[model samples]
Every structure is written in C-alpha cells, then in structure tokens.
Target: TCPFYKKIPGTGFTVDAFQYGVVEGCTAYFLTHFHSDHYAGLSKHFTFPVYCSEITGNLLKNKLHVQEQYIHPLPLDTECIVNGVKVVLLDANHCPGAVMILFYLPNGTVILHTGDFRADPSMERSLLADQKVHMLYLDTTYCSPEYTFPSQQEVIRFAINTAFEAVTLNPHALVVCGTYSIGKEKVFLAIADVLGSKVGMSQEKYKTLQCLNIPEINSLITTDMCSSLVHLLPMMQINFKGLQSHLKKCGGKYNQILAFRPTGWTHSNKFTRIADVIPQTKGNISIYGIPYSEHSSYLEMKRFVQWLKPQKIIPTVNVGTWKSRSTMEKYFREWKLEAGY
Candidate 1:
C-alpha cells in the first residue's frame, strides 16, 4: 500500500490511509512482532530508527530477507531514547521477537501499545515484570464478546493429541499444518515441547529445528539411542501435496490423514468480511478449528480496561481504530458519560 497521511492538519480530524500520526512526529518505531503486517510499513514507507526484540530482528534479517540498512535490534524489556521520545520493548509472548511498546509522550501521557499478544497468563502472574505501561493502545483484533481463545500451551497439547490420535488410528496417517515461516517459530517450538516426551522428529525436521537458535526448545531432541521413530513428520504447506501422496504411497494402515489450521473459531465467523470473501480450500485437507490464538479475547480486553482505568484512550492503526473506537464509546458511556475533560 502506498503512503498517505491519515488526517490533514488545520482541518477537522480524519484518519488518513497508508500513513500514521506517529511516523509524522516520531523518531522511533517499535515492532510488536515480525509478522508481515507489523513491518510492512518499515522498509517501503518509513524506516525511522526501528526498535524491537533481538529474535524478531534476526528473523527479519535472516528469514524475512530484510535489507541490511533497516536492521536495528534491541534487548527485551530495554528502554531506549529516539528523537527525544522514550521507546521501550516488552515481551509479546505471541512470537519470540514480538513485543509490547510503551511510548512516552512529551506531555507526560504514556501510551501502552500491545502489538499482538496472547496475554500469557504467566505475564499477569509476574505482574508484567520488567515493563511498565500507563495508557494502553490495545490490539483488539479479536476484542469482541463473540470471540475467545484457549491458552497457547493448551493449544499445543491439543494439536499434538489430534495428530497423535489420527496417526494412532492409521499408522500411515500424515499431519499437515499452515504456519508463518519466520513469524510463527513458536508454533513449531510448541510441537516439540509437547510431543518430545514421546515422539521425536525426523532427520529432515531435526535439521530444520537446529536453525532456530533457541537452546531450551532444541534440547528436546531424541535421546533414545536405539531409534527415535516418531510416527509423525512436520510438513510445510509447500510440501502438502507431495507429503499426502507419499503417505498414500505407503498404503499400510489407512488412507485418510488429518490436517489442522491452528487458528481461532472467530476467524470462521461470518462477521469477518475477508474470510467470508475468501474461496474455500479445495484439496484433501482436514481442518481443526482449534481456538489457538495469540490475541486477547473480549473478556480480557474489558478487564484490562477496567484495571487501567485511563481517563482518555485513543486507538492506533486501521483495524484498532475500528474496534477500539467502538469499544471506547461503550466504555465512556458506561463509566465516564458525564465527566468533564
């Protein structure tokens, strides 16, 4: 998308497309995650001194093929000054490099921006340790009463169980999943974390895991000296058809296989205009509509709002503008309807 300012100054307020107010006045950019959408504006639109997690930075450098001129990695939970603004990074839990940003405005107003997070209950337990936030610019992509998601660890177990169950029923069964190449390294890590106790990876997949520099996650490799023959193998979307054919070729126990799209049920909701417009899958693929998601649901958002109890709130980004404005309207009406600024 080409760059366009959201609102014209010296006139009534309006959200301009392609650009944001932050970029116009700010000298720093905090990337919440390495997802395509998060960094889409960096290289092409605005490459103002960027800041984020080291893992996320390396993923962009090594995996995402980002140009060398734009690489600026920061440590987790560290604060840095950029163009006189205090920019800080907090863990996002959704991905290794994902982060939550705390931007300090000159007027003493602090805005906490959650890029895309799963709100790992662990964070709450730690009191969001090592990070501080004042007013929050929430990521409300799934912030509606109609939406809810399971914990990430639970989702991992479920995916393993589903794949294991299907394969147990048919020894020749194959499992296929769709994941972001560099963005979702955690998903693959989860698989190993859960299944490592019993099953292990094939030589090819083992080599793939080696490239991921996380030591703890990699330590789960097969130590069973004999032969670590896991009944399953992780196949990328590119190899989906070929893997299916290979499984069919084996032709030992059963012909059917199970596939999963570790996603939220809300994604299938008709209210999502884009999903509705998308053409349905037309291949030998079975989908598991598991509630594995990386964003907080409606209940979490409401509770967080109550806890923070900010006097004023503003939504950032296009999708956030749509959802948070609606949410904030309800919030204002319910709590501060008659308050004076």
Candidate 2:
C-alpha cells in the first residue's frame, strides 16, 4: 500500500498532509486549500513555512489564526520561484482561493498536486497544459464511474429553475437552500439574480464570504431573514423534520418551505449521471436533494486523467481501504490504456 511517490517522495515538502503529523522529510508545508478538518494539525508554533494562494493564506492568518511570519502567499497561474523550485498555483475550480499546486523540481521533476478541483473541461486543459508531469497528487474524491453529477453551472441553473418553479406554484413559499460556510455561493446567487430577490445569511457566514473577497455577494446578502425569500442555512439543518419546525419558528411568514440539501455524497449512483430533483413533502414542506458537488465527477476524472497523462496516477481520497485503492487503480489503468499511454 506504501508507494515511493507519496507526498513528493523525500522532497521535504508535504502538500496537504498535515493530518498525518510529522513526516520523515517534512520541512516546508504546502497547504493547497483549507476545506477539511485534517488541517487542525497546523499550528502557530509549527516551524515549517506554509505556502498557498493569496486568499487561502489570508484565511490561514485571519480565520485559522496561524502566525503570519511563516506564511507564504503566491499568486495564481504564475511560476513563483521558491527554494530553487518552480511552484505554479492554478485555480483548482473547487472553491475561492482553492488551488492546484505544481512543483517543478530542480531535477526536471513536474509534480501536480490538485488539492481539491472541480476539473471542468474548460480550465482542465489550461491548468496542466503541455507539461510532461511526472507525479499527480490527484483529488480522487470521486474516482469511480458511479459519480457524474451535472456541472456546477448546470446545477446552479437547476437550483434557480427549481426555486422559480416552486415559487410559481406557491407564491409565498420561502426558498431555503442549504450550504456550508464556503462553496455553493453560485447556486443561491444565481437564484437571486434570476428571481430578482435578495439573499439572506447569518452574520457569521457573511463574514467568511467577505474574507474570500466575493464582490457579487456584497450586493445580495442581508442579515434580516424576512428581507429575502432565499436564505442560506447549514446542511445539517436542511432535513425534513428540522425544516418544518424552522418554518414554525419564522412566524409563519412563509406558507410552505422549499429547501435544497446539496452534496456530492447524495449524487453517487452508478446508473444515474445527472441529478434529477425528487421532492419530499411532509405537510407543506417540500425538500429537494441536489447532487451539487465541488469535486470532479467520474467522467471529469476520466477526462482529467487522460488530459494530464502523468507518469503516475495517485488517488488522494477514499484510499484508506485496500479494496478502495483497488477500485481506483482499476479505473486508472483503464483510463491510461484508453489514453494510449
């Protein structure tokens, strides 16, 4: 199960491996993004220098409260010279400030670490274009053929259409969509744009979005829940029972609730590719589950693997079990052969 190419292989740079504590050759910590709970190991007292994008580093300092002395914020899509290596940070397309880190080692080694990526066909060709990359630290969160959720733009449009359609039937139906602290901003934003309505969110969540410097949201966000029909809530609270009581707590201003609990896990179906909205109604509550994922889909992963053509394909997530890694390897081998590599 142990491979020599793990974590840049004795390069003294661990890209997003902070969860494992100290490694053998660890010196500089390359944090590709800050979405997982595994980043808790990083601390202000840690001696190693942390490198990331400008906004990612801003969160590391301001939100995570990591010390600024060891922070290194590099620009996107440029070769930043550091420690005699060519480090290029490109938009990962996963979230704001999320990036795919590429390391051009002194000995002609090209290692691309996709911290977390959306892998859209448009930007996929642009990010790792024309380079004979040696090692790929892939974000294989959705490596199997079972997952193929609709593209983010399509899903955003679907969300808008879903809300618009529901509100058309029930004019006073409050549109309540669930999203975490980060990501899924596009879904609700488009809903607001199409519906010509304001988006209301908690002050705690609004402050975090401000940190990412999302200017479009500035015009749309409001603190007053009644100020807008479209509201953003945490994923955990979007369930059927909880959503109904939430309507009661809101003073019955909204006659019925239309909620979207979006996640990639809900989208994992071998037979199904695109997300079809299935409504669950308990009394006046109508909740729809959408397969809105930030990670690359199975087909997107296939295209990305073939496009990159790296010397080795590394599975970053869902590799804990032997059979799970075997599952990824089967797909990897098939993809490599299909690419004529």
lDDT of each: 0.52, 0.78
Error of 1 at 123 (Å): 4.2
lDDT of 2: 0.78
Candidate 1 residues lying further than 4 Å off, grouped into runs, are 1-26, 41-48, 64-70, 120-134, 181-213, 216-254, 267-286, 317-324, 331-341
Best by lDDT: 2
The alpha-carbon deviation from the true structure for residue 226 of candidate 1, after best TM-score superposition, in angstroms, is: 18
Which digits, one per residue and each the tens of the lDDT, describe model 1 over residues 201-296?
A: 455444444444667654655434223223334434424574456455444443554555555555554453321223223364454555566667
Question: What C-alpha lDDT, on a 0 to 100 scale, does residue 307 get in candidate 1?
Answer: 51
Residue 44, model 1, lDDT: 32
| Candidate 1: 10-residue stretch with minimal lDDT | 9-18
Report the alpha-carbon TM-score of model 2 versus the true structure. 0.91
Best TM-score among the predictions, by candidate number: 2
For 254-321, candidate 2 gives per-residue lDDT tens digits of 88888887777563444554445577888888877777788988888788778878888777788679
